[PDB]
């Protein structure tokens, strides 16, 4: 699983399996979390998320 991502800030809002909303710094970081940790998500409109970013839960 890819451990390194570019440091572009292009935030994206996702909904986890536990129905919680996380704003990731970019799509690469979401994919990393899914691959490494076995994290389950779906993209949703930005409005579902808080204005600040979260790390892989």
């Amino acid at each position: 699983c890819p451990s390194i991502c570019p440091l572009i800030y292009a935030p994206v809002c996702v909904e986890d399996s536990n129905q919680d909303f996380y704003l990731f710094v970019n799509e690469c970081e979401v994919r990393k979390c899914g691959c490494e940790a076995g994290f389950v998500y779906t993209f949703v409109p930005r409005e579902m998320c808080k204005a600040t970013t979260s790390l892989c839960p």
Binding site: P2, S3, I4, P6, L7, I8, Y9, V25, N26, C28
Partner: protein, 274 residues
């Protein structure tokens, strides 16, 4: 019809270029998604790919081309202008077309740059954790005399929490945070004790595939302004050590506030190249 992105006059690179110092005889390696070498505003003179199936002189993502443009977009009557337009630019492909990379890929690229006489390394990339091999690679590069520059991270601030990622967090690497056109810290810019300097990272206009341009946000955009500034300093003072260039950038930075949020402040290459 040449475009000068706000970042060029903000770091005072236009003042240094007017002195006749544009990065000539300096070799800079951009460790990223590759570089679109066929772009009219970019002269890629070498490099290497550590991404299977992809050559170093192509960029299926865009990120690496944008970062390279900030360092080195050509001084022509069209397109965009970079910080150090006469640098010898090297594409070291360590990230695939989706932007993702492995520790072994980044290590291989760092080692290639060190072995191949690069004067400066730019790494607009990061992770929450580093590795023993990555720390060894950046320590070797810096000890050899390479100015090693990286994006600090885009994790913002959360009270007193240090949000700097790797490789930026390594002592051998300059951690670069982001400011906007009004020299204010970007909210996404990572914070912490390792934060060293700031450079333009909000709404940075640069080269982008294919033969075009784009406006991007990130500490990825700030890092190349510092890599380019290191190259301008080295074209003026070719006998300086990596440590000397590094101290010139941090000691002459424009103070903006607390080191936790801004490091030493915004780079001023005119003052750094004195």
């Amino acid at each position: 019809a040449q475009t000068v992105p706000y970042g060029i006059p903000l770091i005072k690179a236009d003042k240094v270029q007017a002195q006749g110092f544009k990065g000539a005889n300096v070799k800079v390696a951009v460790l990223d998604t590759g570089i679109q070498a066929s772009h009219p505003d970019l002269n890629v003179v070498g490099g290497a790919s550590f991404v299977a199936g992809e050559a170093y002189n192509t960029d299926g993502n865009g990120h690496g081309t944008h970062v390279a443009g900030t360092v080195a977009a050509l001084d022509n009557t069209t397109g965009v202008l970079g910080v150090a337009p006469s640098v010898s630019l090297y594409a070291v492909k360590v990230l695939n077309s989706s932007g993702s990379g492995s520790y072994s890929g980044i290590v291989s690229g760092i080692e290639w740059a060190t072995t191949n006489g690069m004067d400066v390394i730019n790494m607009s990339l990061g992770g929450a954790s580093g590795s023993t091999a990555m720390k060894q690679a950046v320590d070797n590069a810096y000890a050899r005399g390479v100015v090693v520059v990286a994006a600090a991270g885009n994790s913002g601030s959360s009270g007193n929490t240090n949000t700097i990622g790797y490789p930026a967090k390594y002592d051998s690497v300059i951690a670069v945070g982001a400011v906007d056109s009004n020299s204010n810290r970007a909210s996404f810019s990572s914070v912490g004790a390792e934060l060293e300097v700031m450079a333009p990272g909000a709404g940075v206009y640069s080269t982008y595939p294919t033969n075009t341009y784009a406006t991007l946000n990130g500490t990825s955009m700030a890092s190349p302004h510092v890599a380019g500034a290191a190259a301008l300093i080295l074209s003026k003072h070719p006998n300086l050590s990596a440590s000397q260039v590094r101290n010139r950038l941090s000691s002459t930075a424009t103070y903006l506030g607390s080191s936790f949020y801004y490091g030493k402040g915004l780079i001023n290459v005119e003052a750094a190249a004195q």
